[PDB]
Design a protein around this ligand. Sequence first.
Ligand SMILES: CO[C@@H]([C@H](O)CC(=O)[C@@H](C)[C@@H](O)CC[C@@H](C)[C@@H]1O[C@]2(CC[C@@H](C)[C@H](CC[C@H](C)C(C)=O)O2)CC[C@@H]1C)[C@H](OC(=O)C[C@@H](O)/C(C(=O)O)=C(\C)C(=O)O)C(C)C
Ligand SMILES: [Cl-]
Ligand SMILES: [Mn+2]
Ligand SMILES: [Mn+2]
Ligand code: NA
Length: 294
Amino acid sequence: SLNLDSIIGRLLEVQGSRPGKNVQLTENEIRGLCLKSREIFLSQPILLELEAPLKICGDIHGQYYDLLRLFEYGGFPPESNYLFLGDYVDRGKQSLETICLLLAYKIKYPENFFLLRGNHECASINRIYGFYDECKRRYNIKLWKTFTDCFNCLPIAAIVDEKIFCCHGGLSPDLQSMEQIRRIMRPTDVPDQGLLCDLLWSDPDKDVQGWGENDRGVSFTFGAEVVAKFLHKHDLDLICRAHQVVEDGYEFFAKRQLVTLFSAPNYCGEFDNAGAMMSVDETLMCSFQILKPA
Ligand SMILES: CO[C@@H]([C@H](O)CC(=O)[C@@H](C)[C@@H](O)CC[C@@H](C)[C@@H]1O[C@]2(CC[C@@H](C)[C@H](CC[C@H](C)C(C)=O)O2)CC[C@@H]1C)[C@H](OC(=O)C[C@@H](O)/C(C(=O)O)=C(\C)C(=O)O)C(C)C
Ligand SMILES: [Cl-]
Ligand SMILES: [Mn+2]
Ligand SMILES: [Mn+2]
Ligand code: NA
């Protein structure tokens, strides 16, 4: 019923247009993308087990033309495998185009293209920070709820070749075993506290020893020894996460045991940050492709 290639073609047609040109799919098409992608997300584990090589991207926040640039630089799917770390919607001008292209690629290439849940893939949050408004304006609120129902099924973490632990936010003081992640049932909203919350919301902090209060009003901060201890315990080499705007598009932490990726340059039109995508080669060596600030 869904003609994905037509949908993808229309989404990609605006490459080279005046940045800001909309792609307006039909309501029925977007419903289809939500429903089919939801089924795929539920059919795959909540803790993904992935293989290198792959490209890893952080926050997009509706910067659709920047998403197109990342694909231009990195290779359009399936030329490279992709893992996105969440925060597809809110803040930017073109969340709808952003999420529809991502969902279309998930349906087309479900074993080579992966999306994790960010703290913005949550009705409570995207009600406030732009996506609800974008949906109401360009479609209707019933379609917004369709998006929500899909977001509630996204996986929440990935491990690349048993060595790179990936999530949107960060560690949790409740995370003792990986089985705890695997046990989480879907669909689910993001709770106000606990493991799932923390994976989507926590931040590393150079000035915290152990676990600290998070100025976001949700979850915690964690220090370098929390990272060191976690990697040692679980025989991991790297934590890869997103969630925080960083000036270079990527930023290492805890003697390079953690990296933050943020893929939306000139974030919100308010920052002068680069956006970065991390290229992980066959041996897990990391390099970067970067959208420099304007
Ligand atoms: C100013 O506060 C920070 C951010 O700008 C804004 C945020 O982090 C917000 C998303 C966050 O504070 C909103 C939380 C708020 C909705 C919550 O609201 C409550 C009440 C309403 C309820 C529906 C909600 C449910 C929370 C629960 C976890 C769910 C279901 O999501 O809980 C209570 C607890 C909490 C205050 C700021 O963070 C940054 O600057 C990082 C940057 O990357 C960023 C970002 O949001 O990540 C920016 C610049 C941005 O876009 O604001 C940092 C200095 C602490
Ligand atoms: Cl610490
Ligand atoms: Mn986030
Ligand atoms: Mn974000
Ligand atoms: Na791909």
